Amino acid sequence: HMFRTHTNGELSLKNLNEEVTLSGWVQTIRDKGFMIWIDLRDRYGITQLVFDQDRSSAALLEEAKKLGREFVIQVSGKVIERASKNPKIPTGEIEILVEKLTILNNSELPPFTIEDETDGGEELRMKYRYLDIRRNPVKEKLIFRHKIAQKVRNYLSDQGFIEVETPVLIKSTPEGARDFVVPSRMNPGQFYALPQSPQTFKQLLMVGGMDKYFQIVKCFRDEDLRADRQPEFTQIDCEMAFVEQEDVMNIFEGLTQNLLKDIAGQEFGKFPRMTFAEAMKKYGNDKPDIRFGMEFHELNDLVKGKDFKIFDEAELVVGINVEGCAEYTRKQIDELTDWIKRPQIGATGMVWIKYQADGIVTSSVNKFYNEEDLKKIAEEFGAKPGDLMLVLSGNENKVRAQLSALRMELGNRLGLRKGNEFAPLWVIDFPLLEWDEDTQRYHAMHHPFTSPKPEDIHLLENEAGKARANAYDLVINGNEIGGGSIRIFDKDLQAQMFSLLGFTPEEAEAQFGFLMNAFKYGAPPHGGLAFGFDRLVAVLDGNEVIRDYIAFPKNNSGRDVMIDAPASIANEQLDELALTINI
């Protein structure tokens, strides 16, 4: 039994009068008098079937009246022309005059409708995730994810990259984020860990002469699952030898351009680059969405010394110009003030300045600033009549994050963040170290093997606080897509970095000795980059929730609600592993 001659999305008027066989799911049933119409579905599309006993038989209609939603059926019949074509679907010119029907599975009704806009809540859909996947918004995301993975692997293979599978059962490390562990039966009392990333092995592959490595690979981290955080997640992990920062960025810029061009139909030019300091100062974060304005303007010199204690005592006074919103009401302003006072944000208050359409600049602090003072502030913003400036103050890092949250929240609300617009950029020149004045300590901002920029190595002897890292982050639309760094290959530079970081030679060997010992047999210069694959696909699809790009995700407690994992195992398994559960 051939089950089908065609898919349910490929027939058209060119197939008029052909005899065909189709199989699929009953998407919709329509009854008019004695005739029955059915939308037959598979992955490829919908084909309409018509049951008309006058042109078939009374027995066929008897069986067709038994059909329900999501029945799996097979039909044979003749392609005929519809009276009026449905222009919205590829097969909309034709319909199948059914002659034969076989019910393959008399399905129960689905617990929620199999439709783009379904009546099922999220928890019910995850319980029945295998039926959720039938729906176009989920099926299409899995297909799109597949297309990106193939494009990534073909592009990087063409560049000379070799895909290398690295082990999943590796060695557990005490420090850092929690490992998932795997008890060993053959080695009782001992464990493997699941990998946080291929970091150890990808560096060993550079020592091993592989030159250009990549892997699309699952990673595992047993951390708090907050927003869009899965215990297992997918990365594009890459490592290259004999490269400068510029080489790593150009290669992966080319890949990202390749993906964007295919997805958007537009070539993208050279990606803009910002230093860490520029991004923090202008946007209040190190992964900026540069598709819209509301850039930061610091106001200290214009506002201090005028008896407004809040601005006088703050380390930084900084604001944004919200264009066209000078007519915002008191309720709207208070709503924004309440929103930034939420503990999630932590702001203490907000100052507002209206550049009215009649040209008068007024504020919530007119007792301290006259019209000319306010006008100079509007001039600092380049604001125009009709604009609304919002001003926060506080500690430098704290208030930049608060203002950044407010900027992004306003960007969403005002419709300035569009899923079809893409602004990629690199953030570079992160500080290598961060100094604490009280304790006279440096703390590492990156992995201890991260190289200082070559031109900053001379700074390490006496001015280490001014050294930049040879590191780079790729950002799209305010989402961090990936990043990495150039690594140290000079044994003396590495020891000097460990000393600056507060490690004795013996402490450094205790935590990092395996790789350092391997490097002595001929590590080359090398650097790398890893993408968040889940996030990259979501962003390329104009989305910022990664959940539905994962076929079988977990909930916030790490549980698969569809198969009920994790769960208890048998006593004989525990015994054979030499484990007792603390009770």
Next chain:
Amino acid sequence: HMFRTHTNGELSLKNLNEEVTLSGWVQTIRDKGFMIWIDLRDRYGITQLVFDQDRSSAALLEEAKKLGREFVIQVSGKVIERASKNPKIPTGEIEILVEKLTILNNSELPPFTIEDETDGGEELRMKYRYLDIRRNPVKEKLIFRHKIAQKVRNYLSDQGFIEVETPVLIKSTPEGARDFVVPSRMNPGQFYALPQSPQTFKQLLMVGGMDKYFQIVKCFRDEDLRADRQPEFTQIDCEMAFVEQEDVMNIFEGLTQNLLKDIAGQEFGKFPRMTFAEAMKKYGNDKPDIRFGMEFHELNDLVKGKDFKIFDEAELVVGINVEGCAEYTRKQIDELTDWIKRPQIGATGMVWIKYQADGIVTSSVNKFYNEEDLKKIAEEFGAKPGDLMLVLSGNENKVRAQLSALRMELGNRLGLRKGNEFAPLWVIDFPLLEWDEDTQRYHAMHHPFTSPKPEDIHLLENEAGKARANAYDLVINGNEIGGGSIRIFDKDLQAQMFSLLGFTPEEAEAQFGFLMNAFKYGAPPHGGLAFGFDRLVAVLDGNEVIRDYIAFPKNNSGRDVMIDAPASIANEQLDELALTINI
């Protein structure tokens, strides 16, 4: 700055007189005082460097004399034409007259030679696997594995298969092969399992309408690791909807034809097919190597009834004709008799029949068989003067396995098994069930959801043991490459199969209820196939050892001797997992 303008394998006479910069590992040093020659290596090849004393500073030559094997260096110099060309390597027309030298890493000597024929033993090489990977016999296998993976994904994607990542943290089941398990911190006393295969989820993807799914995917099994048995291993896992057995076979035959043509350079025709019964009878196994002869000939009628008790009492007398070996000496025959008497094989003895060069057939049992008796046996084999027939006897299944081992061993010894020769075939028509008298139930030989061939359904009522399965195995050169089966979608047939297998309804629900219940929402017909990827790559490369196609393998006890995993974890980790080691 820049480490290289070119790789160490791409320069040639076309680059004559260009200034170039190269980096890599010092493969070989030849120092004759007035001139030093260095073979510089990277993944792409070797380029010869010349340090010419009379044309160089004294400092450059002094630095060249500091170089040792596997130093990482960078040089700049001029492409010049070799006086004595090396036709065997791509850069063999040229050499670099070095102007500048930088030691990037003054590597320690490797613990074994970085050469095709190395002086390192296997355990030392695995301890330093990252240095073993530098050698061409290992590097080339990893590159080859990457090439096969790419071809597989491109071929199946073009056929319409969608790659879907399935979870690694899944639910452990008490039955089946032993799971590796993962304790959950967030859900104390509960565990995940690592997947033996994507079995459950690939069926759910058919219920979910994905139609054609595949994955090159890691699998995990905590069973005895004998020879070439890794605790984690890679599969090509595939599943399709609305297919017949023939559909699944044609798709993956096409994939295999594509791979064979690309690697071996010859187009292959339709693959031969044997039933399980035919393979067992002709070759003594269900994964036969058909590239050479020595096919089995059963001899019961020709040997019984001549008062030779051993053959009289034997269930099966069967032999092979070893062409051209009639001059084997008594020591050689005794060696073969001893070899099959080893515990691995378990044979009790061996009879030989020589078709001598003078035309007389003689044997080791002339007391019972005359010249006419021996001649009838030679005719059954189609043996000719110069041939040696070897005959075993015993229980049907045990002696076929013994004779198959002898056949394969002789095939290797005689040079009949060539790595460059490929004979793929399918083995089909396996028995669906096997009867167990001890438990008074049938045993499934494949997945319990495997469907009987349609034409065998009538046998289930009374002769269930004669039913053939809708199942198929792909074999190449005596290696099982993969297999699968068509699944049941009729729940009443499924319930009948559970009864034959000895399950009460309540027991079948306890063990298979999750998929049974999911199928009620519209499982379609579906079938699948999984290949052993490690084995497929090895076989395509003419090898039968899979170890060196795995970048970082484990030893026979499941431990990675390079990083020394598994190992004990911290008491703080055990405590937060509520686990105690049984002392």
